[PDB]
Structure 1
Amino acid sequence: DIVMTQSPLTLSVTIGQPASISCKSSQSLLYSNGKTYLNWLLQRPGQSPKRLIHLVSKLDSGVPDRITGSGSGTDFTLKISRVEAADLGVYYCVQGTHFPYTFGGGTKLEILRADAAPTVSIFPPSSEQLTSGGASVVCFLNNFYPKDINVKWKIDGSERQNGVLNSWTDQDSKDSTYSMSSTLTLTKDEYERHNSYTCEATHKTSTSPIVKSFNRNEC
């Protein structure tokens, strides 16, 4: 089958700047009728894919002409002349010249923006949960940029690496930021045996760890 190689794997561009994606094929995509069936698709977060270009450079109806496609043979390029917020997502090249049809691996386009320090929130176990014999301590690290961040949990001054569950959101199309959730789960008995619970983050926006904690006690 034809192998389609896309580069780069990800690109970070500031709104207003140009961006271009490359797609290389293992066989020439020139069909015997002289036509080249190379398409470009965009799959926005949580959406189905959508065709942007067909026949190498022809734009589908309703697609902004800021988008341009070019190439022939085994080399093709998609170029966005001016990046906008709505351009966030994954771009794929697909060939229909040889059977079976094959797709490239995709290129994720992320909007490069100003650094943003996380807004951190920490939540102790709810009464309902404690009742069931479990205890989860949740920490939300909201709206930060860049995406690269490191969070560690500490109980009474010692790092706890077991029982941690982390989840991240994709880039927000409203402000180009990322958010992440970290949950530490313990038994109710162990929870009620410690004092301090600390959510500690490492991020570019600070030379020292970003900290949020609480002391569980009684009264």
Structure 2
Amino acid sequence: DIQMTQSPSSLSASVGDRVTITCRSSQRIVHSNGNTYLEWYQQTPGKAPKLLIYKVSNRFSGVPSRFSGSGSGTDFTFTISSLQPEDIATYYCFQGSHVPFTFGQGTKLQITRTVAAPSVFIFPPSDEQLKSGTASVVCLLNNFYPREAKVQWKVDNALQSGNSQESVTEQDSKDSTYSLSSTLTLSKADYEKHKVYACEVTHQGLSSPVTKSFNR
């Protein structure tokens, strides 16, 4: 089949930057009728992709003028003239010139913005979950940048490890920040044998670590 290879696999750029993505086919992609059915798609997390460019350089109805495409033969390029916060997504090239129709592997585009420290919140286990025999303590790191962050749990000042999991949101389409959740899971018994629960947060935007806690 025709392999579509995109470069780079991912990148980050500042708002207002000119971004260029490339797609190269392993073979020529000129349909027998003479057309080059090369298209570019944009996909934001959780949603269906959206057509941006078709037949190499034609902009689909409603697509902002900042998006454009070009190329020929086996090398094509997708360009965003002035990147906006809402452009965070994965972009894919696609060829419909020869069956089987194939897609590029996709290029993840993130936004580079100023460092922003997270707001930290801590949540104790609910009364209804406790009667279930398990306790989940949650720590929320809200709207920060860059993505890298360090969360450490402490029960009665004891360092925890192996009993927590974390999740990070997709970069925000408006403020280009990330949010993170850390969940400490303990048994009802363990939880009820301790009083002070706290999560310590370390991040580029914080001059010193932030700690949030509560007394059972």
Query: Is structure 2 residue 96 aligned with structure 1 residue 96?
Result: yes
Deviation at 1:214, TM superposition (A): 2.7
Whole-Å Cα distance in 2 between the matches of residues 25 and 159 of structure 1? 52
Range moving further from structure 2, 156-165 or 10-19:
156-165
SS at match of 2:174: coil
**Residue 14 of structure 1 aligns with which residue?**
14
Aligned residues: percent identity?
Answer: 58
Whole-Å Cα distance in 2 between the matches of residues 161 and 9 of structure 1? 33
Measured on the aligned residues, the alpha-carbon RMSD in Å equals: 1.7
TM-score (norm: length of structure 2):
0.92
**Residue 197 of structure 1 aligns with which residue?**
197
Deviation at 1:196, TM superposition (A): 2.8
1:9-48 correspondence runs (5 A): 9-48=9-48
1:160-171 correspondence runs (5 A): 160-171=160-171
**Residue 2 of structure 2 aligns with which residue?**
2
Whole-Å Cα distance in 2 between the matches of residues 116 and 207 of structure 1? 12
Whole-Å Cα distance in 2 between the matches of residues 153 and 2 of structure 1? 50
Whole-Å Cα distance in 1 between the matches of residues 113 and 215 of structure 2? 36
Equivalent pair of 2:94/2:101 in contact (CA under 8 Å): yes
In structure 1, runs of 5+ residues without a counterpart are none
Deviation at 1:112, TM superposition (A): 1.8
SS at match of 1:23: strand
Deviation at 1:31, TM superposition (A): 2.6
**Residue 137 of structure 1 aligns with which residue?**
137
Q: How many residues align?
A: 216
Whole-Å Cα distance in 2 between the matches of residues 204 and 98 of structure 1? 49
Query: Is structure 2 residue 65 aligned with structure 1 residue 65?
Result: yes
**Residue 117 of structure 1 aligns with which residue?**
117
Whole-Å Cα distance in 2 between the matches of residues 139 and 97 of structure 1? 50
Q: Deviations along 1:67-88, whole A, 9 cap, x unmatched?
A: 1111111111101111122322
Q: Deviations along 1:80-110, whole A, 9 cap, x unmatched?
A: 1111223221110001112101111111222
Range moving further from structure 2, 24-33 or 47-56:
24-33
Match for 1:119: what amino acid? S
CA gap 1:141/1:93 in 2 versus in 1, 3 angstroms? same
TM-score (norm: length of structure 1):
0.91
Equivalent pair of 2:87/2:173 in contact (CA under 8 Å): no
Whole-Å Cα distance in 2 between the matches of residues 9 and 152 of structure 1? 32
Deviation at 1:111, TM superposition (A): 2.0
Whole-Å Cα distance in 2 between the matches of residues 184 and 113 of structure 1? 30
Whole-Å Cα distance in 2 between the matches of residues 200 and 2 of structure 1? 50
Deviation at 1:194, TM superposition (A): 2.2
After the TM superposition, which segments of 4 or more aligned residues of structure 1 sit over 4 Å from their partners?
Answer: none
In structure 2, runs of 5+ residues without a counterpart are none
SS at match of 1:153: strand
Whole-Å Cα distance in 1 between the matches of residues 8 and 210 of structure 2? 32
**Residue 213 of structure 1 aligns with which residue?**
213
Equivalent pair of 2:168/2:179 in contact (CA under 8 Å): yes
Deviation at 1:45, TM superposition (A): 3.0
SS at match of 1:173: coil
